[PDB]
Amino acid sequence: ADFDAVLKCWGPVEADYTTMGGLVLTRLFKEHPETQKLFPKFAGIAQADIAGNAAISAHGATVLKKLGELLKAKGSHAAILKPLANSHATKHKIPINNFKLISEVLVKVMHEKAGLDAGGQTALRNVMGIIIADLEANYKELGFSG
Numbered sequence: 448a449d450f451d452a453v454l455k456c457w458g459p460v461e462a463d464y465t466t467m468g469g470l471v472l473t474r475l476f477k478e479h480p481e482t483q484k485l486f487p488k489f490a491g492i493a494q495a496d497i498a499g500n501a502a503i504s505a506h507g508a509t510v511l512k513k514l515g516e517l518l519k520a521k522g523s524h525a526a527i528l529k530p531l532a533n534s535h536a537t538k539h540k541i542p543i544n545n546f547k548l549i550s551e552v553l554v555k556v557m558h559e560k561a562g563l564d565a566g567g568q569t570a571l572r573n574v575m576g577i578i579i580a581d582l583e584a585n586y587k588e589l590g591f592s593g
């Protein structure tokens with residue numbers, strides 16, 4: 448019931464996927480600059496110009512919309528997830544650790560801007576842990592590391 452809880456807390460996010468999408472990626476890039484290089488479209492953008500950047504916010508919106516779809520599946524996510532693992536391993540070539548980095552940023556932003564309290568934070572970290580474990584498994588099956 449870490450999923451039942453999370454969906455309760457998701458409302459404020461789904462109310463504005465574009466602003467929160469922009470916040471989450473800004474924070475990722477400011478706190479973990481090495482991750483900006485993994486986005487050819489965004490690499491080399493001045494740190495001063497990230498916040499409020501429309502192309503970043505638009506991609507952030509896509510990120511969150513897809514995470515929303517994953518959360519709403521409440522653990523029966525294989526059919527949504529596998530395609531995400533497919534693209535991220537073979538087209539974008541993203542090492543698993545980066546998924547841990549954005550999960551921790553999402554928790555921090557939701558805590559600060561969307562009312563995610565200590566309890567919600569725990570439930571979300573548990574859900575994210577499940578998803579990343581599943582992503583790891585799919586990466587394995589694709590032969591894209593360990």
Ligand code: HEM
Binds near residue numbers: 541
């Ligand atoms: C839970 C986390 C994430 C979700 C839900 C997600 C979702 C998506 C979606 C829906 C797309 C577009 C469709 C596709 O190509 O699969 C995509 C593209 C992409 N993702 Fe992710 N992503 C996640 C994490 C990351 C991370 C951590 C990075 C690198 C640090 C990353 C790098 C990329 C890149 C480079 C693209 C292509 C952008 C483009 O060409 O416009 N993703 N992501």
